[PDB]
């Protein structure tokens, strides 16, 4: 029961996602190698992974209908504030509930709770992060719901620093309408309502994970020997 406009929105987002996500994980061989050992031995590899992913988030966001028609300032604010949330969402594709890990084609590129620890983060982030990944995986989202959720996350009108909040809200409302209609096409009530509510809660969970990651990133990047291990893009996007 999707309108032509709603189908059009979904088609654009699926195209944007397929252009900005490579499921073979070929580029992972180009990062600084993982090392499981010296404090922060996984920070170089995981910083390169996050930096690479920020580029993908930017490439996806620029295809969201209307996003490039916002001011450059609002585009920058939206990407700086949502990048970490979208990375957490995008990572769920390779997350497996057997062993609470992220598999990316090889044993070198399989990440667990310990690797995130070896990038500098503590359990106050890692525990709720794993809980989020488990709750998201059990939703068994279709790719259509996945790309809509990431797009909704990016065009959030309540981000600090947004000037044209009404314009941002206009985009998000169209994405939300499309997601709700897609859910209704697949599920009768009340399962329709329960699934959408759980998706809303996951967006709320991501905001809490954002805050905690920001706290720990500020504590980590404050030390110049830690910032030395990051990338220029990570410093620019996550900075100030």
């Amino acid at each position: 029961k999707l309108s032509e406009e709603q189908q059009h929105i979904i088609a654009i987002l699926l195209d944007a996602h397929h252009k900005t996500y490579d499921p073979t994980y070929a580029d992972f061989r180009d990062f600084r190698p993982p090392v499981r050992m010296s404090p922060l031995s996984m920070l170089p590899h995981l910083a390169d992974l996050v930096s690479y992913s920020i580029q993908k988030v930017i490439g996806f966001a620029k295809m969201i209908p209307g996003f490039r028609d916002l001011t450059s300032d609002d585009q920058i604010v939206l990407l700086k504030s949502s990048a970490i949330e979208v990375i957490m969402l995008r990572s769920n594709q390779s997350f497996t509930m057997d062993d609470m890990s992220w598999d990316c084609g090889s044993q070198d590129y399989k990440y667990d709770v310990t690797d995130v620890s070896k990038a500098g983060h503590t359990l106050e982030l890692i525990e709720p992060l794993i809980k989020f990944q488990v709750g998201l995986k059990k939703l068994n989202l279709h790719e259509e719901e996945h790309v809509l959720l990431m797009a909704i996350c990016i065009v959030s009108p309540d981000r600090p620093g947004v000037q044209d909040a009404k314009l941002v809200e206009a985009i998000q409302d169209r994405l939300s309408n499309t997601l709700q209609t897609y859910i209704r096409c697949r599920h009768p009530p009340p399962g329709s309502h329960q699934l959408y509510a759980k998706m809303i809660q996951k967006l709320a969970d991501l905001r809490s994970l954002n805050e905690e990651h920001s706290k720990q990133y500020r504590s980590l990047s404050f030390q110049p020997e830690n910032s030395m291990k990051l990338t220029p893009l990570v410093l620019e996007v996550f900075g100030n």
């Binding site: 930017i58 620029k62 490039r68 450059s72 920058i76 220029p232 996007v237």
Partner: peptide, 11 residues
């Protein structure tokens, strides 16, 4: 404001 690499990827 000061985000040349982000702006470049946005074009």
């Amino acid at each position: 404001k000061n985000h040349p690499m982000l702006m470049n990827l946005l074009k």
